[PDB]
Amino acid sequence: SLVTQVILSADDELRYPTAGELETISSYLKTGEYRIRLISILQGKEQEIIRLASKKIFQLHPEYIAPGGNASGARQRALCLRDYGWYLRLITYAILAGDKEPLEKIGIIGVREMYNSLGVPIIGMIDAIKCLKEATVEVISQEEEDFVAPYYDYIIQGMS
Amino acid sequence: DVVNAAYPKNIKNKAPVISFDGKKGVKLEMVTLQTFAGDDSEDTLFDYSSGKFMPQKPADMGIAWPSGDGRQAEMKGGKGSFNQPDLRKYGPFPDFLKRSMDL
Amino acid sequence: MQDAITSVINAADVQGKYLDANSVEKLRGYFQTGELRVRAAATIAANAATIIKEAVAKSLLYSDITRPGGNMYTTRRYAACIRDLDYYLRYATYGMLAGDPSILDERVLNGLKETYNSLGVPIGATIQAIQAMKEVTGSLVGSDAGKEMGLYFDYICSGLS
Amino acid sequence: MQDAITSVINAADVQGKYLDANSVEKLRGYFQTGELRVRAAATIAANAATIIKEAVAKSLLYSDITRPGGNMYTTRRYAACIRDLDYYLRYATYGMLAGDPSILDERVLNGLKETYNSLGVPIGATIQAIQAMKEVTGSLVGSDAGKEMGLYFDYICSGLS
Amino acid sequence: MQDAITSVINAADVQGKYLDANSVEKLRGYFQTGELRVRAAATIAANAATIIKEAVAKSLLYSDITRPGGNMYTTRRYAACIRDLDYYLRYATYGMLAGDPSILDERVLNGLKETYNSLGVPIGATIQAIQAMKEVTGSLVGSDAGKEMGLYFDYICSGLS
Amino acid sequence: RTAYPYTGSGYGSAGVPYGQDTYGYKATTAKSITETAAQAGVFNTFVKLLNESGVEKLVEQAGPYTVFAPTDDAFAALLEPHSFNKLATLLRPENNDALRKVLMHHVIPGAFTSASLMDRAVTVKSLAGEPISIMGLNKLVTAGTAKVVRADVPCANGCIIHAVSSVIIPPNYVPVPQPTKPVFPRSVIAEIAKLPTPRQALGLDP
Amino acid sequence: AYDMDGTGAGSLEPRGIKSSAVEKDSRCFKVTFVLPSQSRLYTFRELQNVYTTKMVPFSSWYAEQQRIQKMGGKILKVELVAGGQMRSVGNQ
Amino acid sequence: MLDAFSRVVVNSDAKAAYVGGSDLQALKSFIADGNKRLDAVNSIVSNASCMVSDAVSGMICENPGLISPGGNCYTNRRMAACLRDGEIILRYVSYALLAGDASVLEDRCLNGLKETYIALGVPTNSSIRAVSIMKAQAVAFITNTATERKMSFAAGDCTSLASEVASYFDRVGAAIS
Amino acid sequence: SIVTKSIVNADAEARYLSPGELDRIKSFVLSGQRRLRIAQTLTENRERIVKQGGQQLFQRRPDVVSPGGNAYGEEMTATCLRDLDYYLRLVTYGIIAGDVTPIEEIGLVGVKEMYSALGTPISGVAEGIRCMKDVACSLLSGEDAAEVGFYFDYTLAAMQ
Amino acid sequence: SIVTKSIVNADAEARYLSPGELDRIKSFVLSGQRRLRIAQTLTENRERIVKQGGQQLFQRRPDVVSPGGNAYGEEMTATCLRDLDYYLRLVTYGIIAGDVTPIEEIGLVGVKEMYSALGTPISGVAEGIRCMKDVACSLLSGEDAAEVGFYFDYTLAAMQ
Ligand SMILES: *C(=C)C1=C(C)[C@@H](Cc2[nH]c(/C=C3N=C(/C=C4\NC(=O)[C@H](C)[C@H]4CC)C(C)=C\3CCC(=O)O)c(CCC(=O)O)c2C)NC1=O
Ligand SMILES: *[C@H](C)[C@H]1/C(=C/C2=NC(=C\c3[nH]c(C[C@H]4NC(=O)C(C=C)=C4C)c(C)c3CCC(=O)O)/C(CCC(=O)O)=C2C)NC(=O)[C@@H]1C
Ligand SMILES: *[C@H](C)[C@H]1/C(=C/C2=NC(=C\c3[nH]c(C[C@H]4NC(=O)C(C=C)=C4C)c(C)c3CCC(=O)O)/C(CCC(=O)O)=C2C)NC(=O)[C@@H]1C
Ligand SMILES: *[C@H](C)[C@H]1/C(=C/C2=NC(=C\c3[nH]c(C[C@H]4NC(=O)C(C=C)=C4C)c(C)c3CCC(=O)O)/C(CCC(=O)O)=C2C)NC(=O)[C@@H]1C
Ligand SMILES: CCC1=C(C)/C(=C/C2=NC(=C\c3[nH]c(/C=C4\NC(=O)[C@H](C)[C@H]4CC)c(C)c3CCC(=O)O)/C(CCC(=O)O)=C2C)NC1=O
Ligand SMILES: CCC1=C(C)/C(=C/C2=NC(=C\c3[nH]c(/C=C4\NC(=O)[C@H](C)[C@H]4CC)c(C)c3CCC(=O)O)/C(CCC(=O)O)=C2C)NC1=O
Ligand SMILES: CCC1=C(C)/C(=C/C2=NC(=C\c3[nH]c(/C=C4\NC(=O)[C@H](C)[C@H]4CC)c(C)c3CCC(=O)O)/C(CCC(=O)O)=C2C)NC1=O
Ligand SMILES: CCC1=C(C)/C(=C/C2=NC(=C\c3[nH]c(/C=C4\NC(=O)[C@H](C)[C@H]4CC)c(C)c3CCC(=O)O)/C(CCC(=O)O)=C2C)NC1=O
Ligand SMILES: CCC1=C(C)/C(=C/C2=NC(=C\c3[nH]c(/C=C4\NC(=O)[C@H](C)[C@H]4CC)c(C)c3CCC(=O)O)/C(CCC(=O)O)=C2C)NC1=O
């Protein structure tokens, strides 16, 4: 989370948190419930969104769905929606703890070697998350989707 | 249960203790004659403690560190929508490491 | 090294669940006390040297550990104390902000009681110093904030015991 | 760190005697299989990533170690596995060339099972990964070469147990 | 790491009292032998290689630890001995000057017998070597100086046992 | 092929790894003094008396000690008609004062294993402050009036633990008197009459 | 010289590890610990054993023990193998 | 012996004066009658050299088959072991009299004594005679009604300590029956 | 400032700035209007904040101004107030920078070496800044006094 | 002492002691008769060396004893002289050890942390030791006053 980054970043200098950092905790905690209210909106639309993600990741990339591709077959596609479910679940964690570590300690750190040992094309997974961010805009209004927009494209930046 | 309304507050008076003091009268007495008691109960009516008091430690979480990660053992609420099952299951593990899930 | 939000996420995350309404009660509960913890950590940063000076004068510079032969006699040994007490008042401040004592046993408690036994540092006088340091910390930050900062002091005293 | 020739020279030297007929008898036995080991180590170098991808997908790719909570959950933890399995397939290749498993316990086995218990890594799933990795290695190098490369895999599995 | 003066000051300081007549009484006893210890440490520095050459040839030169299979066979293993015996003759010289064997267990004895058991070094042959080395050291420095230097040799032999 | 083989690798090696198990510097596995005794299940009064008396902090320390912890049969053997005179007074709850020295007489600075006492008689003072003579002759060791039962127990900080058959009382230890009555002289004229006058000291009077 | 010259907060050399070690200290511990790197997955360096047991001096045990937990290490056991306790003079 | 009353630790560097986290409430409460208990154990262990020799010779002169050859107390190793075991039993009641509870007696002295005495052929019907003499001996000494020896105690009462120590001796005597 | 060390933090880590870092640069610049008002209050109150600052300092520490004190006489007392004008100026920098980074490398790094080398009691100058803090927070509302006082007590912490 | 650090010097260098080291252990032990006489003079002059030591200390630093000073009242002034009795004792150790090694690890290592943490002016206690030095060197001849004073000024140097 954000307080953890301040306690850590202040701990390697052997000092208490300064004036600016205590702002960064205080301002983060005052915007508390709005992340809490937002994640309940997204949890009610996880079956909403991943159905829309499978819309365009496969019409864009029929290579993976076709016989021979990695996602060919039922059970391969079955977990395919599961990876969207874990990613969307991770983003609800990142939207709450207002930073990137739950998207980075999980999911991002070492993701390429995971997929490369699986056969999933790592470029295709970048479009999958970009597809997932494209899908979240429809079930979300303009007020709060740019609140969740910077959490998506960090994942794309992490995967390249 | 307190079922002794047969025994009031005159239970253990022990009326027949009798001391003759020679050939004269029997000198009857009702001395109560308590036991070698001790009344074995814990957490009595007061505290009886000056502070000298920091005794509290958490329970051992195995190999990780205490309370750091009892995360496998938690009440929790929701699962997700797709969630493919496990199909090999390899034992329930126990503790996760000097480690956490947020690496 | 987890805060209250990290621990809530994790228990959401080790089992793989989403963030359900009952789990958020502590969080909607942690954000409510977010204003109290910063002001508590504010004054403790200001009066760090004053709090440690008050604790040692109130607990142990009054018993023959301070005199020759006691565990705190030489100036190197005395200077190690206020260096040592600074960590307890500092790391307890971190636990008060993070709302989770995971940082204490991660960075303070492990190998601590096993280290004092090596040096021969009296664990009895150490806890009473922290108890006295907990008593002065409730003076500054108030009652409930002292209840919060005090909740991590005895966590150190419990594990260090 | 001794090969078959180093171990033969050591035992013949440790008694202070020359290389008699029995010492050279084993050395001739090692030189006969010298042609087999290089081709075995040849194809294993080529299909290093393919062998590890086959083992994890065949042993622990789908069972619960991978699902949240188990372990390989996080991408750092998953990436540590194929890094970790690479050493077993690599050091086993060294034992197959040297003809002596001394390099394994020298550089792999010592402090290994004591390390996985610290991290909490499941030794049960680890050995089955190496067993599955041993099964695919017999596919590439053939039967007898698989018998040679397989002879050092279970040596790792035995000591790691 | 305390000499006779450091040990006298420590015991007189650990009770918080001054250096009374008994503390200075031992200190005067140490200063009387100050002239003897330097000349003892003088000749031992000169004949360091000669003393070790005399001890090994008199105790364990031709025994079957020297032959193949024995604990001292290879040239690396033989060279480790005279390197190893040099410390015993050297650190014993330090104890003879400091007048206190605290430096031995601080820097030699701790983890020593636990180390030889790891390597498989024979403690039995080690102590005579030191006993034979103690015997030649009494030759050079004289009788009473040999009594002083000899008093720390068997201290090593006792703890190393 | 020689029996006492060795450790190491490469050429000049006997086929045994370094340190017999590939570890040069082995992490220890012993516990400290007081919970090596707690696991033994025989030093129960000893570890409890240490915890109550505050001596247990002293033998927590990392200094190489040679504890002579008596098994509780030794403590159960404190019901001598003789030894009960000089030791029963410590059962009173105010006399923790002497209980620390009497327990501190069982701690010896240094690591004296029984093998290090091959027909050797060496004395030493405790951490209580008074000398004690450890004597090892004919495969039977002694520590004052100990008659050691179990040889040695390896402990954490290179410390040793020997099981003794009795409790060693310090040499110049006098038993604390029982709690008494502060008595005061009833009269004052029975005491002026008890003092010899100067005229008495010179023999001028009877 | 020693690490306690007068340095504390607000002093010219940066606020850092301050050990209570005397002049040329001769006390050293025997420690045991595991310390996972937690940085190999974006650096891709070779791997080294993380379970070590070694003798650290008293002059720099505190810095090392303060750092072993910095990177998530766990300390399994430490002892004071060489040196005395409560010793005023003689740690040098 | 010395765990039977808890003491207080007043000096520093202890870990129990400060981070004791307790005071032992079950054993402070036993110095509330502690001098009367300590006189009672002193009444036993100043006569424990004579109580065991009188009681073992008491069951010899009532059942004379034990010192007959073929009996279980004829040889010198068995006669020395029979005088040792009554002395050990009289010590362990004197622990349990001192500590005020029988929990020391039942595991260190009575746990596995009936299986031992049938594994050695010890007559269990005669050994319960040997503790009933010591049951009758100890209530004479604690109440100061011994015929040949008195001791100068304070002025008071020591019943409900005599019946406390008589409740330990049959607790021995049924654990071997 | 918060802008420069949120950069050099993400600079060292070989990465860009997270939402946690960019939603606070954003949150800080919208805070910039309110910061200049706060610093504008202390800017032309230095006559009272300093002179009343040295007011309570001498009443609480008469030793430093008494004969033998470091700030004794007409000369040193003028410099005695000069340093308070310095530290009051640096607090105006920290309020506008949103951090004690200006106060860090000016007047705080190695401050004990200077004042120890000048013979000045460093505890005495710490008492002076505390007296200025009560005058400063008495000039502002509660929402502002939690900031202007907030930078003084950091200077109090580093100055001892 | 000179014996213990001449050893640990040659200890670290993997060598024995040179003539330069062994002709000084030799030269020091013949000096040992004269050292005990010097320490014997300061041993039973602590009544005058301390009490006259605090004599000039208060006349030169009346602030520390005045109301508000650290050593104010009957209580602190007793402890005010207690520390001088400490440092006078350590100088007797340094004279007999022939070095400030006893004074180094007792009363010098980390001394600024203690006195700063006690609120005591460390410069004030340095003034106290200097006042003791003039009393001590006034009790001995010129050949001795070059030693007894020699250990005080080392304590003066490390105490600031
Ligand atoms: C042989 C057939 C035979 C005996 C031998 C003798 C043994 C015996 N004694 C008792 C009763 C007591 N024994 C006591 C012991 C002692 N009295 C002393 O004064 C000394 C110190 C000590 C002996 C060395 C005591 C105090 C009693 C109680 C009676 C009294 O007040 O003296 C019994 C048991 C009798 C019973 O249970 O009623 C036996 C068997 N008696 C023999 O008949
Ligand atoms: C039966 C249980 C006994 C028994 C009883 C007899 N007692 C006889 C006479 C007697 N008894 C007492 C004691 C008793 N009488 C009292 O007045 C008092 C109290 C003051 C007591 C305790 C006395 C004093 C006497 C008189 C003796 C005398 O004459 O000197 C007795 C004789 C017949 C009778 O008098 O009733 C009997 C049978 N005697 C036994 O043999 C059994 C065991
Ligand atoms: C009981 C079987 C006796 C008896 C006992 C009483 N003793 C009383 C007081 C008392 N007892 C002792 C000795 C005891 N206390 C100790 O600390 C030690 C060991 C060192 C021993 C052996 C002392 C010192 C005292 C106090 C002396 C005094 O104040 O007079 C006592 C009265 C106090 C109470 O009841 O708590 C009693 C009744 N007296 C008897 O008559 C029976 C035979
Ligand atoms: C004498 C009153 C008895 C009797 C005694 C014998 N006991 C023999 C051996 C024995 N006794 C015990 C129990 C004792 N030892 C303990 O450690 C404790 C409690 C802590 C108790 C009560 C044991 C364990 C043993 C066996 C080991 C040993 O020799 O100590 C014994 C020797 C048997 C033989 O050699 O044939 C005898 C004679 N036996 C009797 O007939 C009277 C009634
Ligand atoms: C929390 C972070 C996290 C992730 C993401 C994760 C992924 C993951 N994906 C896998 C497989 C797979 N994943 C895919 C994925 C895809 N095919 C497509 O066309 C798509 C673009 C994509 C899905 C959206 C396929 C086809 C396989 C099966 C490959 C095989 O085994 O043949 C496997 C092997 C076992 C399994 O399916 O559970 C893992 C562990 N583990 C983790 O811990
Ligand atoms: C050359 C000899 C050698 C080996 C073998 C070795 C292992 C080793 N494995 C490690 C971790 C690990 N190892 C695994 C492995 C697994 N998880 C599973 O479920 C499977 C059963 C298994 C894969 C087969 C994981 C997940 C970690 C990360 C643990 C963590 O982050 O807590 C670590 C911690 C540091 C790091 O990876 O950077 C070491 C040192 N080191 C060596 O020097
Ligand atoms: C951040 C978690 C953490 C802690 C707590 C810690 C403690 C720690 N305390 C130490 C010493 C010490 N600690 C004390 C403390 C005390 N003496 C007393 O009488 C009091 C009871 C107590 C003060 C409250 C003393 C006197 C020493 C010096 C011991 C010596 O020189 O032998 C040392 C030895 C090295 C050094 O100080 O440089 C360490 C490593 N290290 C850590 O990483
Ligand atoms: C921006 C950060 C900063 C500071 C703080 C600073 C301080 C500073 N203070 C000085 C002097 C001084 N400072 C004092 C101060 C005091 N006397 C007391 O009694 C009080 C406790 C205290 C003031 C509250 C005195 C008396 C002098 C003159 C000392 C002398 O003449 O020897 C001097 C030397 C003369 C000068 O150039 O002004 C400097 C450089 N410089 C800086 O750049
Ligand atoms: C052997 C090396 C050594 C030293 C030096 C030492 C000092 C020392 N000085 C103390 C107090 C003190 N020291 C002073 C000293 C002074 N007040 C003044 O005005 C003067 C400038 C100065 C004396 C010349 C005062 C006033 C106290 C009590 C402070 C208080 O009560 O808050 C205390 C706390 C109380 C005690 O236990 O005595 C210690 C430990 N300990 C050591 O082991």
PDB file of N, CA and C in Angstrom, chain C residues 40-75:
ATOM      1  N   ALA C  40      -0.431  11.260  15.923  1.00  0.00           N
ATOM      2  CA  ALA C  40       0.300  10.500  16.927  1.00  0.00           C
ATOM      3  C   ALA C  40       1.752  10.324  16.515  1.00  0.00           C
ATOM      4  N   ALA C  41       1.983   9.962  15.254  1.00  0.00           N
ATOM      5  CA  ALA C  41       3.345   9.852  14.754  1.00  0.00           C
ATOM      6  C   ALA C  41       3.993  11.211  14.566  1.00  0.00           C
ATOM      7  N   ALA C  42       3.198  12.276  14.506  1.00  0.00           N
ATOM      8  CA  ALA C  42       3.761  13.612  14.386  1.00  0.00           C
ATOM      9  C   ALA C  42       4.467  14.023  15.668  1.00  0.00           C
ATOM     10  N   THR C  43       3.752  13.980  16.791  1.00  0.00           N
ATOM     11  CA  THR C  43       4.320  14.452  18.046  1.00  0.00           C
ATOM     12  C   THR C  43       5.419  13.532  18.547  1.00  0.00           C
ATOM     13  N   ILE C  44       5.338  12.240  18.231  1.00  0.00           N
ATOM     14  CA  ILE C  44       6.380  11.321  18.667  1.00  0.00           C
ATOM     15  C   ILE C  44       7.686  11.618  17.954  1.00  0.00           C
ATOM     16  N   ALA C  45       7.619  12.027  16.688  1.00  0.00           N
ATOM     17  CA  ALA C  45       8.828  12.428  15.983  1.00  0.00           C
ATOM     18  C   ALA C  45       9.431  13.678  16.603  1.00  0.00           C
ATOM     19  N   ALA C  46       8.585  14.588  17.081  1.00  0.00           N
ATOM     20  CA  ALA C  46       9.084  15.824  17.665  1.00  0.00           C
ATOM     21  C   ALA C  46       9.765  15.569  19.000  1.00  0.00           C
ATOM     22  N   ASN C  47       9.143  14.771  19.857  1.00  0.00           N
ATOM     23  CA  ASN C  47       9.606  14.554  21.220  1.00  0.00           C
ATOM     24  C   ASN C  47      10.268  13.192  21.375  1.00  0.00           C
ATOM     25  N   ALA C  48      11.028  12.777  20.361  1.00  0.00           N
ATOM     26  CA  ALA C  48      11.700  11.486  20.420  1.00  0.00           C
ATOM     27  C   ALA C  48      12.758  11.467  21.513  1.00  0.00           C
ATOM     28  N   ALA C  49      13.640  12.465  21.523  1.00  0.00           N
ATOM     29  CA  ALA C  49      14.672  12.508  22.550  1.00  0.00           C
ATOM     30  C   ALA C  49      14.084  12.792  23.923  1.00  0.00           C
ATOM     31  N   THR C  50      13.002  13.564  23.982  1.00  0.00           N
ATOM     32  CA  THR C  50      12.416  13.890  25.274  1.00  0.00           C
ATOM     33  C   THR C  50      11.705  12.690  25.878  1.00  0.00           C
ATOM     34  N   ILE C  51      11.091  11.856  25.041  1.00  0.00           N
ATOM     35  CA  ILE C  51      10.392  10.687  25.562  1.00  0.00           C
ATOM     36  C   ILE C  51      11.382   9.679  26.120  1.00  0.00           C
ATOM     37  N   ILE C  52      12.486   9.453  25.411  1.00  0.00           N
ATOM     38  CA  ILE C  52      13.464   8.479  25.875  1.00  0.00           C
ATOM     39  C   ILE C  52      14.171   8.989  27.119  1.00  0.00           C
ATOM     40  N   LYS C  53      14.386  10.301  27.203  1.00  0.00           N
ATOM     41  CA  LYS C  53      14.979  10.862  28.409  1.00  0.00           C
ATOM     42  C   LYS C  53      14.042  10.732  29.595  1.00  0.00           C
ATOM     43  N   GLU C  54      12.736  10.763  29.347  1.00  0.00           N
ATOM     44  CA  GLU C  54      11.777  10.633  30.430  1.00  0.00           C
ATOM     45  C   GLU C  54      11.645   9.190  30.888  1.00  0.00           C
ATOM     46  N   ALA C  55      11.750   8.235  29.963  1.00  0.00           N
ATOM     47  CA  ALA C  55      11.552   6.834  30.315  1.00  0.00           C
ATOM     48  C   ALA C  55      12.707   6.309  31.153  1.00  0.00           C
ATOM     49  N   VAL C  56      13.942   6.592  30.734  1.00  0.00           N
ATOM     50  CA  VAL C  56      15.096   6.060  31.447  1.00  0.00           C
ATOM     51  C   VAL C  56      15.218   6.698  32.820  1.00  0.00           C
ATOM     52  N   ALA C  57      14.881   7.980  32.940  1.00  0.00           N
ATOM     53  CA  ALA C  57      14.927   8.627  34.242  1.00  0.00           C
ATOM     54  C   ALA C  57      13.807   8.155  35.153  1.00  0.00           C
ATOM     55  N   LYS C  58      12.745   7.590  34.592  1.00  0.00           N
ATOM     56  CA  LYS C  58      11.609   7.154  35.384  1.00  0.00           C
ATOM     57  C   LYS C  58      11.642   5.672  35.718  1.00  0.00           C
ATOM     58  N   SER C  59      12.411   4.874  34.981  1.00  0.00           N
ATOM     59  CA  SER C  59      12.416   3.430  35.161  1.00  0.00           C
ATOM     60  C   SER C  59      13.748   2.913  35.679  1.00  0.00           C
ATOM     61  N   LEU C  60      14.849   3.193  34.981  1.00  0.00           N
ATOM     62  CA  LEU C  60      16.120   2.552  35.288  1.00  0.00           C
ATOM     63  C   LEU C  60      17.269   3.543  35.396  1.00  0.00           C
ATOM     64  N   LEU C  61      17.122   4.727  35.618  1.00  0.00           N
ATOM     65  CA  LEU C  61      18.426   5.124  35.982  1.00  0.00           C
ATOM     66  C   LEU C  61      18.102   5.289  37.420  1.00  0.00           C
ATOM     67  N   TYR C  62      17.717   4.239  38.089  1.00  0.00           N
ATOM     68  CA  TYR C  62      17.398   4.310  39.499  1.00  0.00           C
ATOM     69  C   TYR C  62      17.595   2.946  40.092  1.00  0.00           C
ATOM     70  N   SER C  63      18.522   2.186  39.602  1.00  0.00           N
ATOM     71  CA  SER C  63      18.712   0.827  40.065  1.00  0.00           C
ATOM     72  C   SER C  63      19.917   0.346  39.362  1.00  0.00           C
ATOM     73  N   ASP C  64      20.722   0.005  40.228  1.00  0.00           N
ATOM     74  CA  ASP C  64      22.120  -0.388  40.263  1.00  0.00           C
ATOM     75  C   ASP C  64      22.602  -1.052  38.979  1.00  0.00           C
ATOM     76  N   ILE C  65      21.760  -1.168  37.948  1.00  0.00           N
ATOM     77  CA  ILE C  65      22.295  -1.411  36.612  1.00  0.00           C
ATOM     78  C   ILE C  65      23.050  -0.184  36.135  1.00  0.00           C
ATOM     79  N   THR C  66      22.651   0.993  36.611  1.00  0.00           N
ATOM     80  CA  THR C  66      23.332   2.232  36.281  1.00  0.00           C
ATOM     81  C   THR C  66      24.665   2.365  37.001  1.00  0.00           C
ATOM     82  N   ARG C  67      24.806   1.746  38.162  1.00  0.00           N
ATOM     83  CA  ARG C  67      26.017   1.846  38.960  1.00  0.00           C
ATOM     84  C   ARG C  67      27.047   0.842  38.450  1.00  0.00           C
ATOM     85  N   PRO C  68      28.261   0.830  39.016  1.00  0.00           N
ATOM     86  CA  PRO C  68      29.276  -0.120  38.550  1.00  0.00           C
ATOM     87  C   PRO C  68      28.864  -1.560  38.785  1.00  0.00           C
ATOM     88  N   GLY C  69      29.153  -2.403  37.804  1.00  0.00           N
ATOM     89  CA  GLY C  69      28.727  -3.778  37.821  1.00  0.00           C
ATOM     90  C   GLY C  69      27.379  -4.004  37.182  1.00  0.00           C
ATOM     91  N   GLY C  70      26.492  -3.022  37.256  1.00  0.00           N
ATOM     92  CA  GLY C  70      25.196  -3.129  36.627  1.00  0.00           C
ATOM     93  C   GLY C  70      25.338  -3.156  35.126  1.00  0.00           C
ATOM     94  N   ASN C  71      24.303  -3.622  34.443  1.00  0.00           N
ATOM     95  CA  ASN C  71      24.354  -3.706  32.998  1.00  0.00           C
ATOM     96  C   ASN C  71      24.391  -2.642  32.051  1.00  0.00           C
ATOM     97  N   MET C  72      24.850  -1.493  32.500  1.00  0.00           N
ATOM     98  CA  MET C  72      24.615  -0.232  31.827  1.00  0.00           C
ATOM     99  C   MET C  72      25.639   0.753  32.346  1.00  0.00           C
ATOM    100  N   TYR C  73      26.732   0.214  32.875  1.00  0.00           N
ATOM    101  CA  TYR C  73      27.666   1.036  33.627  1.00  0.00           C
ATOM    102  C   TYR C  73      28.462   1.949  32.710  1.00  0.00           C
ATOM    103  N   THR C  74      29.277   1.386  31.824  1.00  0.00           N
ATOM    104  CA  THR C  74      30.198   2.178  31.019  1.00  0.00           C
ATOM    105  C   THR C  74      29.453   3.068  30.036  1.00  0.00           C
ATOM    106  N   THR C  75      30.117   4.141  29.604  1.00  0.00           N
ATOM    107  CA  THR C  75      29.469   5.114  28.734  1.00  0.00           C
ATOM    108  C   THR C  75      29.116   4.526  27.380  1.00  0.00           C
TER     109      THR C  75
END
